Design an enzyme around this catalytic site. Structure first.
Site, PDB file in Angstrom:
ATOM      1  N   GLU B  16       0.867  -1.153   0.000  1.00 15.09           N
ATOM      2  CA  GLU B  16       0.000   0.000   0.000  1.00 15.09           C
ATOM      3  C   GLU B  16       0.922   1.227   0.000  1.00 15.09           C
ATOM      4  OE1 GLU B  16      -2.168   3.375   0.587  1.00 15.09           O
ATOM      5  OE2 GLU B  16      -0.654   2.693   1.999  1.00 15.09           O
ATOM      6  N   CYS B  63      -5.991   4.608   5.839  1.00 17.65           N
ATOM      7  CA  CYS B  63      -5.677   3.420   5.069  1.00 17.65           C
ATOM      8  C   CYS B  63      -6.912   2.531   4.867  1.00 17.65           C
ATOM      9  CB  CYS B  63      -4.593   2.662   5.784  1.00 17.65           C
ATOM     10  SG  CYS B  63      -4.014   1.218   4.790  1.00 17.65           S
ATOM     11  N   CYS B  66      -5.549  -1.658   5.667  1.00 19.40           N
ATOM     12  CA  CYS B  66      -5.870  -1.878   7.062  1.00 19.40           C
ATOM     13  C   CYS B  66      -7.069  -1.023   7.451  1.00 19.40           C
ATOM     14  CB  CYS B  66      -4.646  -1.665   7.940  1.00 19.40           C
ATOM     15  SG  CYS B  66      -4.009   0.018   7.998  1.00 19.40           S
ATOM     16  N   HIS B  70      -7.894   1.958  12.109  1.00 17.40           N
ATOM     17  CA  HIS B  70      -7.783   3.319  12.611  1.00 17.40           C
ATOM     18  C   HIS B  70      -9.087   3.833  13.182  1.00 17.40           C
ATOM     19  CE1 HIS B  70      -3.670   4.130  11.219  1.00 17.40           C
ATOM     20  NE2 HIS B  70      -3.997   3.379  10.156  1.00 17.40           N
ATOM     21  N   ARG B 461      -0.149  -5.023  10.759  1.00 18.77           N
ATOM     22  CA  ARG B 461       1.257  -4.634  10.592  1.00 18.77           C
ATOM     23  C   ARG B 461       1.954  -4.253  11.911  1.00 18.77           C
ATOM     24  NH1 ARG B 461      -2.009  -4.022   6.781  1.00 18.77           N
ATOM     25  NH2 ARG B 461      -1.367  -4.786   4.741  1.00 18.77           N
ATOM     26  N   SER B 484       3.658   0.917  10.283  1.00 16.31           N
ATOM     27  CA  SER B 484       4.669   1.129   9.239  1.00 16.31           C
ATOM     28  C   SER B 484       5.554   2.336   9.523  1.00 16.31           C
ATOM     29  CB  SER B 484       4.036   1.235   7.860  1.00 16.31           C
ATOM     30  OG  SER B 484       3.414   0.026   7.447  1.00 16.31           O
ATOM     31  N   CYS B 528       2.886  -0.212   4.529  1.00 11.48           N
ATOM     32  CA  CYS B 528       1.690   0.601   4.249  1.00 11.48           C
ATOM     33  C   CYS B 528       2.075   2.063   4.375  1.00 11.48           C
ATOM     34  CB  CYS B 528       0.612   0.127   5.220  1.00 11.48           C
ATOM     35  SG  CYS B 528      -0.989   0.852   4.779  1.00 11.48           S
ATOM     36  N   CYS B 531      -0.571   4.582   5.741  1.00 11.55           N
ATOM     37  CA  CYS B 531      -0.508   4.384   7.189  1.00 11.55           C
ATOM     38  C   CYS B 531       0.702   5.089   7.778  1.00 11.55           C
ATOM     39  CB  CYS B 531      -0.410   2.907   7.549  1.00 11.55           C
ATOM     40  SG  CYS B 531      -2.021   2.157   7.851  1.00 11.55           S
TER      41      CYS B 531
END
Ligand code: SF4
Ligand code: SF4
Ligand code: F3S
Ligand code: MG
Lengths: 267, 534
Positions: B16, B63, B66, B70, B461, B484, B528, B531
């Protein structure tokens, strides 16, 4: 990457969260494997393509210059502040990339509210000067079909592409350049809670017995009455949609909704 | 001798977001690396002054890979700031949707993002489908026949013969590549299962929408709990359960056996991509205010000392900007965070990324499945121990093999298998709680004028945290520190290489024009960048 038999699609990622790309992977009847193997030739797509780096850049150039023509699908807003610096791919600004590629497309679809209208990074104070594709590229004659939502229903993308391949033309579009076949009704006029709205039966809180019983979410902020989308009709993932999950619509297929529809829990 | 000189990979695809990797190689091996994230959006700037209730809707759009994570972190963060203790059922439903997220995310990562680094799809065309079916039936309880695989082969043959290779255009394996090792039949099995996984992931995602309205970007969380009264019904629970069962079968019968067959073929990959330090926040709480109540527990490990797991102290996180495109050089704890963009172009003033560089007690920390698995293992987690031991025994390697690109990839499978089983346990507990007559899913709460809050999620992640300062009942400061960011952010003001940069040192590069080995390690972290930068 292409030429012959299947129409070539060049899929670009600007300032985006990749939720729009993920929404296409949820395609149902047809599914995404039918779409990629049978219906279309997906000739550039950073999320899933095999090539990286120079090899990826070469794949892109070969697709955009093809004598057979390509369709562009664009995800994400274009950051324009500070000469496009806030977003680059292959050390080129996204503004420059889209400026050079999208006028060569036979047709452009802006997919998701970020690409159509600027989206989340364009919310106040818009530090990166993010713009929707048609706003950013007005001066170049680009008029993308806008498929809005955050992310849109993938039914709406596949339906627009299939129309276009059939009819060699865009379907009827609204004044925000969205296909009226999908965006012609408010989500509210389609909502199962409309009889409660008509009766002034509103849930006063999410913990209330009114919310348990399914009363209207307008007092809790629902933006259904001012939002155009086909959510209650098509639903998402073949099974649900926000107010059937008990939560108000946040208006995510409308321009500037991050600032126009906020605070999300007030009307 | 081998190649000496720079290699640049921009874009890094099959991640991503927008990543540029730069390496210096000497005599065919990487000697230096830079992780450069090349898109900034500035969601933290945009949140300033807004209603804290609105934060989860903006931050979910950090994101869509994922997705949900969030929203969950911001809701946990504002729940915490407001001091609400959400009902047991909101904890179960939030936990079940997050479990479903991990299964969707990791299945798609292994097949659709990682496997083209290791599978030559065009070599599948030369495979013997009868031989391939026998191999596939030997590694899985599921029975695969020659005709099953021939159908895949036939379809791929018509595709390649059209000359329109689509997503396989200019692939690093085209024509052959010395770092691609699989035989034709194993390439066919993996390719079949890649295709299968494209439809299975539809079901895995649907499981999230059963309770959570839609995928991507769920819409069922609120401060104080969840909104989905329909999630209490036997019908929705049954729908979820059927999708989970089918997703778990795919994990158990398709993904893990494929992971093991590929890992065995690439056992040399136990030698590259290791890292020193690990952080994890734990996940799937019984108590929203106690991380140690989570099914996976938080912890910190330095220099692979798993005998001395350190408690996680949230005050020891600081985010560096000296090598990032932000003002100045001062690291900040996220409750005093600053997001002040200032671009200097690549390596201008030694700055080369839009990610900040989080450090824990000054050290760079890997987070993600390898951190979660090794720390849980070292905490005595029985389920994690049982399947990582079985994976180790199947592969014939010792635990040192886990500190590598191969081991990270295996840990992603181990966590998938463990979470797939635990989702059943959570479902049962949820069912039991409803059966006791507890039908409450949201609790009332009041907005304080001034408050601080933090929400912790262990995402697919790794450790995710959202930090809020509430001032006059509005967002005074909102900071995201995302997995990330930890793993792929740049160097700090002590010039310490981040986990991805350090892991790249030592990587062999057979062909500088097709540097698949760099992608193998970078993809093993599952980057990501939306992210990491937000
Ligand atoms: S429209 Fe929404 S889902 Fe799509 S890229 Fe933008 S923020 Fe992500
Ligand atoms: S819940 Fe929303 S969309 Fe439905 S009737 Fe009420 S205001 Fe309209
Ligand atoms: S939030 Fe968006 S997904 Fe539909 S229900 Fe409202 S337009
Ligand atoms: Mg941050």
């Amino acid at each position: 990457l292409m030429g012959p038999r299947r129409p070539s699609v060049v899929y670009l990622h600007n300032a985006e969260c990749t939720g729009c790309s993920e929404s296409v992977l949820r395609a149902f009847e047809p599914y995404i494997d039918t779409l990629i193997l049978d219906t279309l030739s997906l000739d550039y797509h950073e999320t899933i393509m095999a090539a990286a780096g120079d090899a990826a850049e070469a794949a892109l150039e070969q697709a955009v210059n093809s004598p057979h023509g390509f369709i562009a699908v664009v995800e994400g807003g274009i950051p324009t502040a500070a000469n496009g610096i806030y977003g680059k791919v292959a050390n080129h600004t996204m503004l420059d990339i889209c400026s050079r590629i999208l006028p060569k497309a036979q047709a452009v679809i802006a997919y998701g509210t970020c690409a159509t209208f600027g989206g989340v990074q364009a919310a106040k104070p818009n530090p990166t000067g993010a713009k929707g594709v048609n706003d950013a590229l007005k001066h170049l004659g680009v008029k993308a079909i806008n498929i809005a939502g955050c992310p849109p229903n993938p039914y709406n993308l596949v339906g627009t592409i299939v129309y276009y391949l059939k009819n060699k033309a865009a379907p009827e579009l609204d004044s925000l350049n969205r296909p009226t076949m999908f965006f012609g009704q408010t989500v509210h006029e389609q909502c199962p809670r409309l009889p409660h709205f008509d009766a002034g039966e509103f849930a006063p809180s999410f913990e209330s017995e009114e919310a348990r019983k399914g009363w209207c979410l307008y007092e809790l902020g629902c933006k259904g009455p001012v939002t155009m989308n086909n959510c209650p009709k098509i639903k998402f993932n073949q099974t649900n949609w926000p107010v059937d999950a008990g939560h108000p619509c946040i208006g995510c297929s409308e321009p500037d909704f991050w600032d126009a529809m906020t605070p999300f829990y007030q009307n | 001798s081998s190649y000496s000189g720079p290699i640049v990979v921009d874009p890094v695809t099959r991640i991503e977001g927008h990543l540029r990797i730069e390496v210096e190689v000497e005599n065919g091996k990487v000697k230096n690396a830079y992780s450069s994230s090349t898109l900034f959006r500035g969601l933290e700037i945009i949140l300033k002054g807004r209603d804290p209730r609105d934060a989860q809707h903006f931050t979910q759009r950090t994101c869509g890979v994922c997705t949900y994570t969030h929203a969950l972190a911001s809701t946990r963060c504002v729940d915490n700031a407001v001091g609400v203790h959400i009902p047991k059922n909101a904890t179960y439903i939030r936990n079940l949707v997050l479990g479903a997220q991990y299964l969707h995310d990791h299945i798609v990562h292994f097949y659709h993002l990682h496997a083209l680094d290791f599978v030559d799809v065009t070599a599948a065309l030369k495979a013997d489908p009868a031989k391939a079916a026998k191999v596939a039936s030997s590694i899985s309880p599921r029975k695969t026949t020659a005709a099953d695989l021939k159908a895949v082969q036939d379809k791929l043959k018509t595709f390649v013969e059209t000359g329109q290779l689509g997503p396989f255009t200019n692939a690093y394996f085209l024509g052959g590549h010395p770092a691609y090792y699989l035989d034709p039949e194993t390439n066919l099995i993996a390719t079949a299962h890649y295709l299968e996984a494209l439809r299975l992931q539809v079901k895995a995602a649907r499981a999230m929408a059963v309770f959570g309205a839609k995928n991507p970007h769920t819409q069922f969380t609120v401060v104080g709990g969840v909104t989905c009264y329909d999630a209490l019904t036997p019908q929705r629970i049954a729908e979820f359960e059927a999708l989970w069962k089918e997703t778990k079968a795919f994990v158990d019968e398709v993904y893990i056996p494929d992971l093991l067959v590929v890992a065995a073929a690439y056992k040399d990959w136990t030698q590259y991509g290791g890292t020193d330090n690990f952080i994890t926040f734990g996940e799937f709480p019984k108590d929203e205010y106690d991380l140690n109540s989570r099914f996976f527990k938080p912890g910190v490990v330095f220099k692979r000392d798993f005998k001395n797991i350190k408690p996680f102290d949230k005050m020891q996180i600081e985010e560096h900007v000296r090598h990032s495109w932000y003002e100045g050089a001062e690291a900040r704890h996220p409750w005093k965070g600053q997001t002040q963009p200032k671009y200097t172009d690549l390596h201008g003033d030694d700055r080369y990324s839009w990610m900040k560089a989080p450090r824990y007690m000054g050290e760079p920390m890997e987070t993600g499945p390898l951190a979660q698995v090794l720390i849980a293992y070292s905490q005595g987690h029985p389920k994690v121990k049982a399947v990582t031991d079985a994976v180790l025994a199947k592969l014939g390697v010792g635990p040192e093999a886990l500190f590598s690109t191969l081991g990270r990839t295996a840990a992603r499978g181990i966590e998938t298998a463990v979470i797939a089983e635990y989702v059943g346990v959570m479902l049962q507990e949820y069912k039991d709680n409803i059966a006791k007559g507890d039908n409450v899913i949201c609790a009332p709460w009041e907005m304080p004028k001034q408050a601080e809050g933090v929400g912790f999620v262990n995402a697919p992640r790794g450790g995710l945290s959202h930090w809020i300062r509430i001032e006059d009942g509005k967002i005074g400061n909102f900071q995201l520190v995302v997995p990330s960011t930890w793993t792929l952010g740049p160097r700090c003001d002590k010039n310490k290489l981040s986990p991805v940069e350090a892991s790249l040192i030592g990587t062999p590069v057979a062909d500088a024009k097709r540097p698949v080995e760099i992608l193998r390690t970078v993809h093993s972290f599952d980057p990501c960048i939306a992210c990491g930068v937000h």
